Amino acid sequence: MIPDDEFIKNPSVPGPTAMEVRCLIMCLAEPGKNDVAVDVGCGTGGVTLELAGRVRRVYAIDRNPEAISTTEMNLQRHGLGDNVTLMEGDAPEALCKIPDIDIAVVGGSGGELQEILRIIKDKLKPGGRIIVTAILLETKFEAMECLRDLGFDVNITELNIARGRALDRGTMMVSRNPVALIYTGV
Amino acid sequence: MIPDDEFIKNPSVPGPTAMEVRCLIMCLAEPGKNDVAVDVGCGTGGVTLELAGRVRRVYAIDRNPEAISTTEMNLQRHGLGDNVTLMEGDAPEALCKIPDIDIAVVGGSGGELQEILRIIKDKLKPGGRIIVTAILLETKFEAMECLRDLGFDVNITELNIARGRALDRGTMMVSRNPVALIYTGV
Amino acid sequence: MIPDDEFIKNPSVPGPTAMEVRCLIMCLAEPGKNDVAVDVGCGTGGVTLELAGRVRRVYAIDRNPEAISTTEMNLQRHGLGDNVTLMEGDAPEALCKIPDIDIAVVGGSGGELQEILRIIKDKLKPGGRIIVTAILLETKFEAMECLRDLGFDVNITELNIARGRALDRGTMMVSRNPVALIYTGV
Amino acid sequence: MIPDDEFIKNPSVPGPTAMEVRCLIMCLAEPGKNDVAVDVGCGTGGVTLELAGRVRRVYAIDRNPEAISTTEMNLQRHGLGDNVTLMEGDAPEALCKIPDIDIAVVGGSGGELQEILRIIKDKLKPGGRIIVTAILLETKFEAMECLRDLGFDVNITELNIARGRALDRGTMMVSRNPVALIYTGV
Numbered sequence: 001m002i003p004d005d006e007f008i009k010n011p012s013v014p015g016p017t018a019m020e021v022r023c024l025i026m027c028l029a030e031p032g033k034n035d036v037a038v039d040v041g042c043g044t045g046g047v048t049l050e051l052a053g054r055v056r057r058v059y060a061i062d063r064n065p066e067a068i069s070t071t072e073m074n075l076q077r078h079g080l081g082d083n084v085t086l087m088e089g090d091a092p093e094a095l096c097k098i099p100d101i102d103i104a105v106v107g108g109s110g111g112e113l114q115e116i117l118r119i120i121k122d123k124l125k126p127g128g129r130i131i132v133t134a135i136l137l138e139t140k141f142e143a144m145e146c147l148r149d150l151g152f153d154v155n156i157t158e159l160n161i162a163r164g165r166a167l168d169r170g171t172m173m174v175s176r177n178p179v180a181l182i183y184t185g186v
Numbered sequence: 187m188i189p190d191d192e193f194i195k196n197p198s199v200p201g202p203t204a205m206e207v208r209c210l211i212m213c214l215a216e217p218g219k220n221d222v223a224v225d226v227g228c229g230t231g232g233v234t235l236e237l238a239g240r241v242r243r244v245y246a247i248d249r250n251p252e253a254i255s256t257t258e259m260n261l262q263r264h265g266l267g268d269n270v271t272l273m274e275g276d277a278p279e280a281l282c283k284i285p286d287i288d289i290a291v292v293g294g295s296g297g298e299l300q301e302i303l304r305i306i307k308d309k310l311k312p313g314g315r316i317i318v319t320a321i322l323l324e325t326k327f328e329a330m331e332c333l334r335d336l337g338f339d340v341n342i343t344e345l346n347i348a349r350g351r352a353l354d355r356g357t358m359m360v361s362r363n364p365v366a367l368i369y370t371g372v
Numbered sequence: 373m374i375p376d377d378e379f380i381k382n383p384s385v386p387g388p389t390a391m392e393v394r395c396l397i398m399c400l401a402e403p404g405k406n407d408v409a410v411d412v413g414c415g416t417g418g419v420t421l422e423l424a425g426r427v428r429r430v431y432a433i434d435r436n437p438e439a440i441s442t443t444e445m446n447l448q449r450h451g452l453g454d455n456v457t458l459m460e461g462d463a464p465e466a467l468c469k470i471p472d473i474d475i476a477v478v479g480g481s482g483g484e485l486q487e488i489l490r491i492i493k494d495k496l497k498p499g500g501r502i503i504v505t506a507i508l509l510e511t512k513f514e515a516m517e518c519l520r521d522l523g524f525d526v527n528i529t530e531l532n533i534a535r536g537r538a539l540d541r542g543t544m545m546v547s548r549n550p551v552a553l554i555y556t557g558v
Numbered sequence: 559m560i561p562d563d564e565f566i567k568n569p570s571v572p573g574p575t576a577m578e579v580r581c582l583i584m585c586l587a588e589p590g591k592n593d594v595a596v597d598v599g600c601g602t603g604g605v606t607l608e609l610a611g612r613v614r615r616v617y618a619i620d621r622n623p624e625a626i627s628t629t630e631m632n633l634q635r636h637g638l639g640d641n642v643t644l645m646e647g648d649a650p651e652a653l654c655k656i657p658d659i660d661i662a663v664v665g666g667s668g669g670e671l672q673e674i675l676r677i678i679k680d681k682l683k684p685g686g687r688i689i690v691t692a693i694l695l696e697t698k699f700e701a702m703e704c705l706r707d708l709g710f711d712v713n714i715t716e717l718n719i720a721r722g723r724a725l726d727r728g729t730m731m732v733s734r735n736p737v738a739l740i741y742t743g744v
């Protein structure tokens with residue numbers, strides 16, 4: 001993995017997603033060199049950069065032009081990005097312009113989760129995987145329900161991570177806010 | 187329990203200890219109206235205030251004179267403090283001046299945990315309880331090994347707490363750093 | 373707090389609720405000697421026993437006759453139960469037969485959470501507290517929306533508890549399933 | 559990742575290590591096709607199988623003849639194993655017979671952690687990575703002190719994982735015991 005500290009960040013754009021979470025997203029996604037992936041709400045680019053180096057084509061979407069700008073910087077810096085199509089704009093409309101996908105990671109929904117998912121279902125190639133990253137309690141509930149209603153077998157794993165911070169004398173355990181991963185299939 | 191946001195802070199002083207943790211500290215301590223308690227490293231006063239309203243006499247110790255002033259402000263602010271003896275100074279010398287104790291909560295050791303624990307065993311009335319609050323990995327190990335070496339039946343419980351926060355479009359789970367409670371048999 | 377291992381379990385009855393959770397429930401409930409409390413879904417009696425020794429009258433409700441029997445057994449074993457009115461039956465019908473309450477703990481809803489909460493609100497005395505114990509993701513969401521819709525100031529805390537256990541001459545950390553407490557402003 | 563439920567368990571051999579933990583071990587290990595790895599205490603084979611399909615040669619060690627049998631069995635069922643050298647015996651003895659390593663995962667130490675680590679240092683190729691999986695509190699402390707003492711830049715990450723399970727028409731969260739990963743520098 002590309003460590004979190006190698007991500008240039010713009011304080012107005014969240015991310016990158018916790019390395020341990022991005023690691024699990026990749027395990028769940030099972031990126032293949034012939035896969036076409038979409039990262040809805042690319043933010044700082046934490047998920048996009050990892051997908052960039054493992055799949056054929058990645059479509060990174062974001063409402064915020066700054067997120068688009070920051071994701072491109074991190075890509076440029078890590079020598080990735082020539083197989084990444086950046087798309088500024090609201091997800092539903094952006095999603096309609098791309099081809100079918102093998103992998104769909106929803107890093108942000110902005111109130112349009114349900115709409116985003118329905119669309120993703122219609123574009124998901126057979127054997128495709130959907131992974132929704134949820135920090136809001138509502139999102140965890142809505143992602144679960146949405147995917148079930150669309151006919152998927154849904155699973156949810158919540159991660160509570162703590163890392164050692166050498167805080168002058170000992171190692172203090174500093175926790176990261178919990179993040180849940182709602183993912184489809186069996 | 188006095189909510190955490192009703193504690194007057196001071197930048198140099200850590201605390202108050204997470205309400206959920208203070209709650210468990212009290213459950214493990216089993217405060218009695220005829221108990222004499224000592225709060226080693228009172229900090230902001232989170233543990234001292236709770237003990238104040240439940241036991242006969244509380245001895246609150248701290249190296250930081252600002253921890254002493256902040257604990258006083260909080261004691262006065264909540265109408266408590268007439269059964270609290272504040273003691274500024276390093277714990278080992280401060281501990282030697284107090285009578286025997288029924289309850290001992292170690293909220294901070296500053297490198298002298300082992301010494302602090304030994305003195306505490308010497309002043310512990312029968313049936314007394316010792317509870318060490320540990321945020322450093324090293325402290326969790328030492329508190330366990332030390333209390334066992336002093337002949338106590340030891341236990342440890344770690345709490346990972348997450349609370350909700352109305353975040354910009356919903357409810358975000360904001361985790362608190364993990365805190366372990368190393369305690370001796372009652 | 374009455375230790376978890378001092379509770380007799382029945383195969384068809386869940387519980388007792390984790391001591392650390394019961395501890396927090398009590399901190400949030402702030403039991404007073406003149407309080408009238410209701411424990412919806414008493415199960416094994418974990419919450420009922422604690423309330424029994426702190427309030428004036430407790431109304432313990434449960435669908436399962438085996439739960440009513442176990443809660444009754446555990447009270448007797450602990451010399452409690454004279455201020456406890458056991459009520460077998462579905463929560464809504466039973467809730468309508470009791471007087472107004474100062475404290476309401478919902479330990480189980482069985483699909484009728486919303487109904488149970490509406491009824492509790494209609495019977496809550498001024499300054500009363502409601503605490504819902506949620507292990508199901510749906511319940512955490514449902515309790516939050518419902519309490520707000522009923523005009524309450526809602527809060528949620530999710531505890532992840534780990535307890536040390538002897539293993540290989542060392543100490544292994546054993547986790548308990550996470551439990552969330554959804555409670556209203558006091 | 560090879561799903562957890564796709565490993566055959568022997569009742570006397572622990573494992574496989576939680577998929578989410580094995581996922582992170584791989585992220586931290588950064589397996590390369592020309593890497594030589596050693597899995598100290600292979601148990602059920604959770605770490606060995608993952609390394610098998612990513613590196614050049616893997617040396618899987620275990621005291622338990624049954625652990626060696628379970629690992630070979632799981633290797634065979636997944637069509638792996640031709641690049642895995644199984645070694646029954648105590649780790650230090652076994653570690654001395656293998657060539658230098660790029661990756662070292664310590665899945666079990668059995669009281670000889672310090673010795674095992676000192677030896678791993680003596681055979682670690684430049685740019686090599688060491689990752690110790692710790693479930694015992696003592697091991698977390700020990701791994702840190704030892705690795706610091708051997709001159710490494712040490713880090714610790716503690717994972718608390720919860721997975722949803724269908725219960726009473728809802729989804730309850732089921733936690734796994736916490737596991738810490740103590741790993742070395744660049």
Ligand SMILES: Nc1ncnc2c1ncn2[C@@H]1O[C@H](CSCC[C@H](N)C(=O)O)[C@@H](O)[C@H]1O
Pocket residue numbers: 013014015016017018040041042043044045046047061062063064067089090091092107108109110111112
């Ligand atoms: N409906 C929508 N359409 C497009 N982008 C959206 C959106 N709702 C939210 N977003 C974007 O969702 C992103 C979530 S932050 C994502 C961080 C990223 N996973 C990382 O690892 O760096 C934000 O940049 C936000 O603007």
Ligand SMILES: Nc1ncnc2c1ncn2[C@@H]1O[C@H](CSCC[C@H](N)C(=O)O)[C@@H](O)[C@H]1O
Pocket residue numbers: 199200201202203204226227228229230231232233234247248249250253275276277278293294295296297298
């Ligand atoms: N050896 C020692 N003697 C006295 N005070 C000490 C000490 N080691 C640490 N401390 C004190 O330990 C405290 C830890 S912060 C404690 C916060 C408190 N439990 C609350 O709930 O508000 C600090 O104020 C620090 O100065």
Ligand SMILES: Nc1ncnc2c1ncn2[C@@H]1O[C@H](CSCC[C@H](N)C(=O)O)[C@@H](O)[C@H]1O
Pocket residue numbers: 385386387388389412413414415416417418419433434435436439461462463464479480481482483484
């Ligand atoms: N609508 C309802 N009416 C009555 N009891 C209900 C109910 N829905 C669920 N329950 C009961 O809710 C209980 C939840 S288990 C509660 C365990 C208890 N808190 C303890 O500490 O021991 C079960 O015994 C179940 O039958």
Ligand SMILES: Nc1ncnc2c1ncn2[C@@H]1O[C@H](CSCC[C@H](N)C(=O)O)[C@@H](O)[C@H]1O
Pocket residue numbers: 571572573574575576598599600601602603604605619620621622625647648649650665666667668669670
């Ligand atoms: N000194 C030692 N030498 C060799 N094996 C050892 C050892 N100390 C402990 N072990 C082994 O350590 C293993 C730990 S269990 C490992 C499970 C494995 N990580 C999985 O994912 O399946 C056991 O099989 C045990 O016998």
